[PDB]
């Protein structure tokens, strides 16, 4: 009933970098976190990381449920040397959406998910800040990129900032993770034409004993 995360950072339990593969649905009243824990495999950070850690520390653990997004006209299998899982891989709970072919236009898409449970749903997504505009063009097509998240009486947009920051280890881009808590019976909507890392599953707090 008390769990030692080791190399897995607590927020990694939500998105699933390879160091967190054995914790994607953990159950624990006390969570032990370690200096060697990392939330990420590709360089980046969680928005409101401190607040979200607070929520998860007293959550009693997490149970994952499918969000049911399906796709066509794009690749859903973006991967990176940074996340090693028998070669290049990605976050286990997320899908790195790419245009069907290099430099091809990414289609404007909209995906929605309704929380049909009685508890609030924790929903994460990533925004990819490519290391270069050529990379962004290569991955999603050229032109302006925009991601919009909406829920009941709420809308917020994110515009990728393609630039080259210090490498980690060799990659100058960043994937930052954003989240929201979806009330029972509310619907989250994502509108995006690229630079969007999509959730495959939502997380529900288990509650303590």
């Amino acid at each position, epitope marked *: 009933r008390t769990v030692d995360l080791g190399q897995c950072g607590l927020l990694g339990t939500i998105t699933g970098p390879p160091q967190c593969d054995q914790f994607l649905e953990f159950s624990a009243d006390l969570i032990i976190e370690r200096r060697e824990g990392s939330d990420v495999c590709y360089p980046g950070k969680f*928005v*409101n*990381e*401190e*607040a*979200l850690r*607070q*929520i998860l*520390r*007293e*959550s009693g653990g997490i149970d994952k449920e499918a969000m049911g997004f399906t796709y066509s006209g794009i690749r859903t299998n973006g991967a990176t040397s940074a996340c090693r899982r028998s070669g290049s891989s990605f976050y286990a709970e997320m899908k790195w959406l790419l245009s069907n072919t290099d430099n091809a236009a990414f289609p404007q898409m909209t995906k929605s998910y309704k929380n049909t449970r009685k*508890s*609030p749903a924790l929903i994460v997504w990533g*925004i990819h800040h490519s290391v270069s505009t050529a990379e962004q063009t290569k991955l999603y097509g050229s032109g302006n990129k925009l991601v919009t998240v909406g829920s009941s*009486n*709420y*809308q*917020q*947009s*994110f*515009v990728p*900032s393609p630039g080259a920051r210090p490498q980690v280890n060799g990659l100058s881009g960043r994937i*930052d993770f*954003h*989240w*929201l*808590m979806l*009330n029972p019976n509310d619907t989250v909507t994502f509108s995006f034409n690229g630079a969007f890392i999509a959730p495959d599953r939502a997380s529900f*707090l288990r509650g303590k004993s």
Partner: antibody
Amino acid sequence: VQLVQSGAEVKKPGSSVKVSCKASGGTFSSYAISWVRQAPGQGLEWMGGIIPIFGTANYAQKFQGRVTITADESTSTAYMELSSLRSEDTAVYYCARDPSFWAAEYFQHWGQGTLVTVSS
Amino acid sequence: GDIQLTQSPSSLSASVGDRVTITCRASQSISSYLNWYQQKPGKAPKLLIYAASSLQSGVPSRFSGSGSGTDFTLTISSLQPEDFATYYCQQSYSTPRTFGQGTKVEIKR
């Protein structure tokens, strides 16, 4: 959603105060409650927040475990208790509704405020 | 550590009909996680803009928020008499929540 706070308080240095914030309307469990204070003539200062449906709170470190925020879902009431009061704690204390559960904390509706005067 | 917000100007003189511009600069990049409030003497602040450019329901359309990353602006087009007040930015990106020092918009004469 209306937020109605308890009345003004006068306290001596070193004592403590507990302010109440009662939410009318619907579904206390559908949002978080934050506490923000304002000293006379000064700007705004965030103290912390609570998510009632989870019972979890988040605090500003500057307050050094002097603050305790709690909530009672049966009465749709949140509380802020501030201990070891000092003169600099003299301020109007507000509660506010944060629909984002700390994901993008914003203060969508506010209480009327509670003056707390700390003095000998 | 904490995110510091620097608002400017601190005090502004304006007339009805003016276009008023208030800037907020954050000490690190915070994407679109910035809110704007209005406050008048003796009253709690009131939310105008959340998420840098989303208009709160019921707020007049002359209030426009812009910016992403570190530089943010609140633009009040066509300043109205009920707009003379103090304005605050607040970042929603990190703990602790922090505010700009405020901008007072007063009546020119």
